Design a binder for this molecule. Structure first.
Ligand SMILES: [Mg+2]
Ligand SMILES: [Mg+2]
Lengths: 153, 155
């Protein structure tokens, strides 16, 4: 009744982490390395599956630090009870490219710069395997039957 | 007497270096840090002075690794016997600036790129204090009197 079943799908998967018992969510890790130039979109794999129980929905959503200090935008995933596949994080680099502004650096998930292997548009990001990118929050839901009516009351 | 006198003019000066007794030249080192955007020129100080003996000229000239893997072009200076001031390396960055393209990256003397403090044109080099930039080759010379003639004639 108070345990969530988890599957690790590969040697690159990491068990979800929680600091205190009272915290709202579990931190979720990237299982892959992905380069996002400005305005690029992707669904980044975690190699983790969970079993959300009947009567709830899982929310796969952003973190404060990452969203306020970078241009990486995560669209909140609604995880159905019974979805048992690989969790994916829905992301966009919403930076806008500037003309001829180029660099051998890439931004990381902390907003810091490191030297990379290529010349790219300034504002490109690199997500690394192991990056603490998103978090999982789980909340109760109402799932009623629908009744069509002509007037409410 | 087969010795060349050398003066070190500062704490940034490096004594010239040679590998092999048979090598043509002595490698020469930059005493300063210089940024050159495309088409930019400078004379770069070494803080070294030498006394070339009478009957010779010193040739301050490029190295194959530097000139073939970068756009840094060195014009061979001719050092007179009796020039005793600071030796300078006469250099141009002969990369061409490409439209916009700006960057925080700068290239070094090995052709590699690192990250810099400012935004500049793509193609900018940065030379560092201690870079092994040039060599010195010393050759003998003929310095005759001139005679004007109406027609040339056999010696
Ligand atoms: Mg936008
Ligand atoms: Mg030219």
């Amino acid at each position: 009744t108070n345990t969530l079943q988890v599957r690790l799908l590969s040697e690159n998967a990491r068990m979800p982490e929680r600091n205190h018992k009272t915290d709202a969510g579990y931190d979720i890790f990237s299982a892959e390395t992905v380069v996002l130039e400005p305005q690029e979109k992707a669904v980044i794999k975690t190699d983790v599956a969970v079993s959300i129980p009947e009567g709830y929905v899982g929310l796969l959503t952003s973190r404060s630090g990452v969203s306020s200090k970078t241009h990486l935008v995560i669209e909140t995933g609604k995880i159905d009870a019974g979805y048992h596949g690989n969790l994916g994080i829905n992301i966009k680099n919403d930076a806008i490219a500037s003309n001829g502004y180029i660099t051998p650096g890439v931004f990381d998930i902390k907003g810091e710069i490191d030297l990379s292997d290529a010349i790219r548009q300034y504002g490109t990001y690199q997500i690394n395997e192991g990056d603490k990118l998103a978090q999982l929050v789980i909340v109760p839901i109402w799932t009623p039957e629908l009744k069509q009516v002509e007037e409410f009351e």
